[PDB]
Amino acid sequence: MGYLHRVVEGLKANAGGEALVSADRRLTGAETLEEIHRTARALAAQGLRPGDGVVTLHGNGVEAVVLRIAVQLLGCRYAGLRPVFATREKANFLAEAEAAAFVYQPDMADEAAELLREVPTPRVLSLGPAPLGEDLVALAGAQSAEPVEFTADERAATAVGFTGGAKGVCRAPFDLEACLDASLTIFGEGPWRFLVCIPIADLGGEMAEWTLAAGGTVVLREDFEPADILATIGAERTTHVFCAPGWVYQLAEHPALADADLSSLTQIPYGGAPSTPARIADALEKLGRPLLVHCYGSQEGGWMTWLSAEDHVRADRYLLNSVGKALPGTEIAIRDQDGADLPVGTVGEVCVRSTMLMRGYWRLPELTAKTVRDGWLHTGDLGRLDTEGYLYLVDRAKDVIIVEAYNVYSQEVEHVLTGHPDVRYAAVVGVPDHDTTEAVYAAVVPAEGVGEIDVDELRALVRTTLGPVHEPKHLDVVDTIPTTPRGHPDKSALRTRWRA
Numbered sequence: 303m304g305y306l307h308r309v310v311e312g313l314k315a316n317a318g319g320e321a322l323v324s325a326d327r328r329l330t331g332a333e334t335l336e337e338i339h340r341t342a343r344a345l346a347a348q349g350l351r352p353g354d355g356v357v358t359l360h361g362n363g364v365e366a367v368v369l370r371i372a373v374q375l376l377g378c379r380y381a382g383l384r385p386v387f388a389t390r391e392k393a394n395f396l397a398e399a400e401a402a403a404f405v406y407q408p409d410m411a412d413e414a415a416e417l418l419r420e421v422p423t424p425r426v427l428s429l430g431p432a433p434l435g436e437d438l439v440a441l442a443g444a445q446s447a448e449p450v451e452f453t454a455d456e457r458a459a460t461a462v463g464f465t466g467g468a469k470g471v472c473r474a475p476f477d478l479e480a481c482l483d484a485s486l487t488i489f490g491e492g493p494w495r496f497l498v499c500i501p502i503a504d505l506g507g508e509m510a511e512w513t514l515a516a517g518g519t520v521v522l523r524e525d526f527e528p529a530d531i532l533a534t535i536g537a538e539r540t541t542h543v544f545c546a547p548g549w550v551y552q553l554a555e556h557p558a559l560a561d562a563d564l565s566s567l568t569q570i571p572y573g574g575a576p577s578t579p580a581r582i583a584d585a586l587e588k589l590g591r592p593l594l595v596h597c598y599g600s601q602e603g604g605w606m607t608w609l610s611a612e613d614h615v616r617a618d619r620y621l622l623n624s625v626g627k628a629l630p631g632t633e634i635a636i637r638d639q640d641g642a643d644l645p646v647g648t649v650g651e652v653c654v655r656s657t658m659l660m661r662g663y664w665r666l667p668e669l670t671a672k673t674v675r676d677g678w679l680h681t682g683d684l685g686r687l688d689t690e691g692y693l694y695l696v697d698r699a700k701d702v703i704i705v706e707a708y709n710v711y712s713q714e715v716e717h718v719l720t721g722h723p724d725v726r727y728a729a730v731v732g733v734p735d736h737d738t739t740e741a742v743y744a745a746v747v748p749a750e751g752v753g754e755i756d757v758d759e760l761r762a763l764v765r766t767t768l769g770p771v772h773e774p775k776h777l778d779v780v781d782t783i784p785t786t787p788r789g790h791p792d793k794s795a796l797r798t799r800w801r802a
């Protein structure tokens with residue numbers, strides 16, 4: 303009965319219990335709810351009204367979550383810059399935003415001034431003592447904690463999340479409550495004790511709101527470092543920590559895992575980037591129980607599928623190369639070049655329809671209309687369904703390797719390679735071929751205790767599984783697979799390195 307209603311009621315149900323725990327500060331539900339009201343009235347006092355854009359620049363402090371909710375409670379449009387983003391990318395976003403306020407962490411006051419010289423914004427605000435603008439925690443300090451009722455259009459965008467090259471995904475309460483609803487399906491009923499070490503600016507902050515909504519406790523960390531995270535799980539008695547798949551491996555392999563206490567976890571949901579099945583298998587063996595839950599989502603589509611914990615260890619199937627089944631209410635069609643629905647089993651673009659679809663891309667109505675067509679999000683992912691409804695991603699459309707007019711799917715070839723015991727990690731990419739236009743390059747990282755990889759054994763296994771053309775013409779053993787700023791392997795830089 304309204305997205306912020308859901309958040310607030312969650313905080314009212316957790317009034318006396320912890321709600322926001324960072325390493326610096328701890329609020330109850332009642333304390334948390336009080337800061338939100340006072341922050342919201344403070345922002346209102348500064349002139350912000352429904353529809354006004356509030357760009358922010360902060361880490362994952364407590365103050366960041368109160369800010370996100372308070373801005374949205376007013377009905378304003380929260381637009382959170384990740385810290386990780388290059389400063390130029392931030393400016394371009396801040397400029398694109400019809401920004402009515404800019405709210406920054408003191409710690410980051412340098413960057414604030416570079417961006418604000420570059421985009422003069424009114425209502426510069428600081429989350430504590432700071433060189434620039436007024437101090438918002440002070441302003442809230444002197445404000446009443448009287449509840450502020452959400453009264454804006456549930457359908458109008460209250461959040462914008464940035465995705466690089468470089469786009470803001472707008473979200474309204476409507477689609478956010480549906481995202482909330484899906485989270486309860488994935489993560490189970492609340493209350494959760496949820497370890498968020500993802501930016502509050504974007505996905506970490508929605509996950510914060512979901513946790514609170516379901517009446518739970520957000521445990522904030524700035525980022526993922528496996529040793530801190532293992533300590534935090536036991537100390538803060540976490541029920542969930544959302545991981546990039548690499549992070550999952552870092553936990554499961556970390557020497558201090560043996561001394562850590564993980565008994566509090568119900569789940570370790572993971573997603574955001576392609577997993578290595580064999581590695582998820584090892585993580586599963588090393589953790590000792592079905593904790594892992596595979597989540598497939600996008601900022602545009604919200605949650606699309608999840609592979610449950612039980613399906614990770616289902617006796618009669620191997621499903622670790624699946625991102626699982628549709629969430630209740632999510633329809634999935636697999637479509638060809640022209641938008642024809644393909645029969646179950648065939649490869650095509652994953653197109654999803656649900657009430658979780660974004661409101662659309664910020665100030666990009668053309669691109670919106672190319673991406674969402676007749677209420678169907680075209681994901682740019684390629685995959686197939688199976689007769690039990692599991693989704694298998696084989697490639698991003700942009701990564702497909704065209705050899706002699708046949709389609710080689712890079713992600714699908716990696717899984718074959720990584721499935722090999724001698725291979726730990728792999729990246730497949732297309733490079734120029736005189737004869738076949740594009741040939742298949744695979745870089746493979748050897749497992750521990752593997753010496754010389756038999757590159758012919760590996761080509762055979764791909765031929766034998768996918769067929770001849772899927773065979774890597776070029777097969778480098780490497781130390782390391784380069785990575786992009788945002789959890790994802792750097793395919794450009796392998797294309798780039800392979801020429802020279």
Ligand SMILES: Nc1ncnc2c1ncn2[C@@H]1O[C@H](COP(=O)(O)CP(=O)(O)OP(=O)(O)O)[C@@H](O)[C@H]1O
Nearest residue numbers: 464465466573574575576577597598599600601788
């Ligand atoms: N569990 C999973 N397994 C494989 N690919 C996944 C995945 N979850 C997400 N993806 C991939 O990553 C996409 C999700 O990206 P978005 O949420 O839109 C931006 P992002 O990956 O966070 O990058 P950004 O740094 O530009 O924000 C999907 O459309 C799909 O290609």
